[PDB]
Amino acid sequence: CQLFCPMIYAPICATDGVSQRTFSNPCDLKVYNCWNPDNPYKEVKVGECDDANKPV
User: Fold this and answer.
1) Is residue 55 within 8 Å of 43, Cβ to Cβ?
2) Domain spans of the chain?
3) I need a labelling partner for 32 at 20 to 30 A (CA). Which of 14, 40, 46, 53 fits?
4) Beta-carbon contacts of residue 4 (< 8 Å; ≥ 6 apart)
5) Which segment of the chain is annotated as a signal peptide (predicted)?
6) CA gap 20, 56 in Å, rounded
7) Residue 32: enclosing H or E segment and its boundaries?
8) From CA 23, how far away is CA 56, in angstroms rounded?
9) CATH class of the domain defined by 1-56
């Protein structure tokens, strides 16, 4: 876990095999997986992605 959050509005898409979710910023995402072991997310790209996309 690396916690360094900049003040910018950038949506990011991350998929953990299941239908993906979009966060307000990459730093807001990393914190979620860090202390939440049962519900982790894997970063694909910074955007809005669907379930028909390729894993990055």
Assistant:
1) no
2) 1-56
3) 53
4) 27
5) none
6) 13
7) helix 26-35
8) 17
9) alpha beta
Q: Is 31 helix (H, G, I), strand (E, B) or coil?
A: helix
Q: What single letter denotes the amino acid at residue 6?
A: P
CB 38 within 8 A of CB 8: no
* Angle CA 21–15–24, to nearest 5: 35
Q: How was this structure determined?
A: NMR
Those residues whose C-beta lies under 8 Å from the C-beta of residue 47, and which sit 6 or more positions away, are 11, 12, 13
